[PDB]
Amino acid sequence: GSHMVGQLSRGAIAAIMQKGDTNIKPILQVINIRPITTGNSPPRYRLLMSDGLNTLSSFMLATQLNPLVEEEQLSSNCVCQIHRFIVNTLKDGRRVVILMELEVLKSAEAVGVKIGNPVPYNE
Ligand SMILES: O=C(O)c1sc2cc(-n3c(S)nnc3-c3ccc(F)cc3)ccc2c1Cl
Ligand SMILES: O=C(O)c1sc2cc(-n3c(S)nnc3-c3ccc(F)cc3)ccc2c1Cl
Ligand SMILES: O=C(O)c1sc2cc(-n3c(S)nnc3-c3ccc(F)cc3)ccc2c1Cl
Ligand SMILES: O=C(O)c1sc2cc(-n3c(S)nnc3-c3ccc(F)cc3)ccc2c1Cl
Ligand SMILES: O=C(O)c1sc2cc(-n3c(S)nnc3-c3ccc(F)cc3)ccc2c1Cl
Numbered sequence: 001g002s003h004m005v006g007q008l009s010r011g012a013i014a015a016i017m018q019k020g021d022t023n024i025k026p027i028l029q030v031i032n033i034r035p036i037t038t039g040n041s042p043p044r045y046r047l048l049m050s051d052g053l054n055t056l057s058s059f060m061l062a063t064q065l066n067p068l069v070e071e072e073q074l075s076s077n078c079v080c081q082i083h084r085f086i087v088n089t090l091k092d093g094r095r096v097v098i099l100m101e102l103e104v105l106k107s108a109e110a111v112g113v114k115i116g117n118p119v120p121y122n123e
Contacts, residue, residue, distance in 0.1 A: 005052045007029075009027045009028065013055075029111070030049060052116045061098075073107060077113065085101075
């Protein structure tokens with residue numbers, strides 16, 4: 001429907017990264033998904049997600065959610081509710097938001113476009 005940016009939890013990315021809020025169940029859009037280099041361990045997917053205001057490229061799917069990408073079209077443009085996530089910090093100090101449970105509210109094909117004009121979140 002109209003006001004597509006109203007579909008997304010504007011400000012949730014800043015809340016996750018600055019406040020470390022994990023109680024929220026924000027609605028985000030997938031902008032892109034790609035594998036990372038994992039050698040002889042399970043494939044792992046990194047996501048560029050949008051909350052309508054910001055994009056952030058430091059999301060990863062928990063391994064348990066891999067089938068959503070492999071089989072069920074979790075893909076660019078879909079709109080998802082994040083039901084459970086955590087944030088982990090790597091040795092270099094960068095943070096990764098690991099999506100543990102998520103629900104696709106609208107398929108990529110039902111949305112079809114990057115909603116709004118989100119800009120990259122800076123650290
Ligand atoms: O394929 C490649 O050669 C590389 S080198 C490479 C280096 C990083 N990287 C960054 S940034 N900061 N620290 C590291 C790093 C990663 C793994 C490691 F043990 C040591 C250091 C991250 C990914 C990556 C990849 Cl992928
Ligand atoms: O400074 C750089 O350019 C490089 S090149 C470079 C290459 C590696 N590296 C080698 S060798 N073999 N596997 C890896 C590796 C890359 C990414 C990763 F997740 C784990 C391991 C690890 C760190 C690194 C860094 Cl740091
Ligand atoms: O977004 C990120 O986390 C990273 S980590 C990261 C690490 C590298 N990197 C380093 S250091 N040394 N070699 C590489 C490298 C990794 C993969 C590749 F095919 C070619 C080169 C290059 C880009 C990049 C990016 Cl981009
Ligand atoms: O293959 C690749 O493109 C990459 S990029 C890449 C980046 C990292 N890395 C380091 S160090 N510190 N934070 C991260 C990082 C990992 C996933 C992510 F969402 C954001 C950041 C570790 C491995 C890796 C690999 Cl492997
Ligand atoms: O700095 C560190 O402690 C770590 S942890 C770490 C983990 C990975 N890695 C591989 S393989 N498969 N999935 C991941 C992974 C990366 C980031 C993350 F959130 C969770 C998992 C790749 C590089 C790296 C580095 Cl570099």
